[PDB]
Nucleic acid binder design. Sequence first.
RNA 1: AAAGAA
Length: 93
Amino acid sequence: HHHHSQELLKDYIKRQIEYYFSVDNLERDFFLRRKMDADGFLPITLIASFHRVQALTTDISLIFAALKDSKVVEIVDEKVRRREEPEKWPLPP
RNA sequence: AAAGAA
């Protein structure tokens, strides 16, 4: 027993989601950007369906917990966006 | 290139 399994899992979830919201990924992620609203937000439940997140967990409240203190993303209601200049990224649906 | 990290 060398770590708390659910805390480690939360760190994997957080870093996987922060990757999607990195500038490097966003520059090329046309699917993700077409799903943004005009303010840059995506449903957290959409992110939950992405294959690597769903592989790590199907517990939605755990994904919220994993993201609670992220400096990369901001959460409003059940939606999430890049904290820095989110409005640059949406693309037409 | 099956979501080859939507």
